[PDB]
Write a protein that binds this ligand. Structure first.
Ligand SMILES: *[B@@]1([O])O[C]C2=[C]C(F)=[C][C]=C21
Ligand SMILES: [Cl-]
Length: 260
C-alpha cells in the first residue's frame, strides 16, 4: 500500500524514484529503490558542508578563515559569491551559501579547501557511507546521464548519513547545530519536501536539480508532536531536457507523512 502508491506515482510520473525515510521516533524506515544509485546533483553540497564541519573540529579557526577568491572562480550559478567578489567570504559563509542558495563557486571553493574531490569521498567513508561518490567538479557533475555511476549515491546511504550527521553523533554539538541551522535557512526548498509537509512543521533541506529532469531533495523535518524525521527523495526521467518534477517530491512527502 505504502509501496504501491509510490510505484504508482513513479509509473504516472514516467521517471525512476528513490525514497528513504527514517523516523528517529521509533527507528522505522520506509524504503523504495533505496539501494539503487541516483545522481545526487546539488544534494552533495550537504555532505560537503558536513566534511568542512568535520575538519573544523581540529581547526578552531577554519570557519572564520577569510577566503579571497578570484574573478576566474565565478560560475554561471553563484548569486552569493558573485555578490561578495570584492570583499571575499569566510569559509563559514561559503558553507551557508552553498547550502542555502546552492552556489556552485562556493562549492568548488570548499572542495579545494578540503584538498580535492577525494577528501569528500574519504569523509563519506569515515562516516560509514560506502556509496557516496563524487567524480567531477561543478558544473560538470549534474549531467545525470542514464546509468552513469559518476556522482551518485543511494537514497539509503544519504538518509543514514543525514541521520548520523544532523541527528546522530557523527559530529560534536556545535558543528551538529551549525549543520541543522544552515539547512533550516535553505531558500531552494519551498516547492519540494516543504510543500508536502504540515505548514506548522519546521523543515531543513538540501535540493538538487540537473539534466534528465533530475529533481532531488534531502531533509530533516521537525514535527509538532514527536521526534525529527529524515526524508530523502531522488527522481530522474526519460529525456535529457526533461523539466523538473518538484510536484513529485511534494506528493511523495504527502504519502510518507500519511503513513506516519
Ligand atoms: B544544483 O543541483 O542545485 C541547484 C543548481 C543550479 C545549478 F545551476 C547547477 C547545479 C545545481
Ligand atoms: Cl546538539
Amino acid at each position: 500500500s505504502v509501496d504501491k502508491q509510490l510505484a504508482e506515482l513513479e509509473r504516472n510520473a514516467n521517471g525512476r524514484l528513490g525514497v528513504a525515510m527514517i523516523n528517529t521516533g521509533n527507528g522505522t524506515k520506509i524504503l523504495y529503490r533505496a539501494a539503487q544509485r541516483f545522481p545526487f546533483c546539488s544534494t552533495f553540497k550537504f555532505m560537503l558542508a558536513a566534511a568542512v564541519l568535520d575538519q573544523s573540529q581540529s581547526q578552531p579557526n577554519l570557519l572564520n578563515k577569510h577566503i579571497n577568491y578570484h574573478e576566474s572562480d565565478l560560475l554561471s550559478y553563484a548569486p552569493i559569491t558573485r555578490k561578495n567578489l570584492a570583499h571575499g567570504m569566510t569559509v563559514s559563509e561559503l558553507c551557508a551559501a552553498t547550502i542555502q542558495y546552492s552556489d556552485n563557486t562556493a562549492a568548488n571553493l570548499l572542495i579545494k579547501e578540503l584538498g580535492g574531490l577525494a577528501a569528500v569521498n574519504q569523509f563519506a567513508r569515515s562516516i560509514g557511507d560506502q556509496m557516496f561518490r563524487l567524480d567531477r567538479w561543478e558544473p560538470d557533475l549534474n549531467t545525470a546521464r542514464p546509468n552513469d555511476p559518476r556522482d551518485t549515491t543511494t537514497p539509503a546511504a544519504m538518509a543514514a548519513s543525514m541521520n548520523k550527521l544532523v541527528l546522530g553523533d557523527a559530529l560534536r554539538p556545535a558543528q551538529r547545530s551549525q549543520l541543522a541551522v544552515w539547512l533550516k535557512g535553505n531558500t531552494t526548498g519551498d516547492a519540494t519536501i516543504r510543500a508536502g509537509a504540515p505548514t506548522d512543521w519546521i523543515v531543513g533541506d538540501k535540493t538538487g536539480s540537473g539534466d534528465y529532469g533530475t529533481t532531488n531533495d534531502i531533509a530533516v523535518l521537525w514535527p509538532t508532536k514527536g521526534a525529527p524525521i529524515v526524508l530523502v527523495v531522488y527522481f530522474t526521467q526519460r529525456e535529457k531536457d526533461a523539466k523538473p518534477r518538484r510536484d513529485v517530491l511534494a506528493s511523495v512527502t504527502k504519502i510518507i507523512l500519511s503513513q506516519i
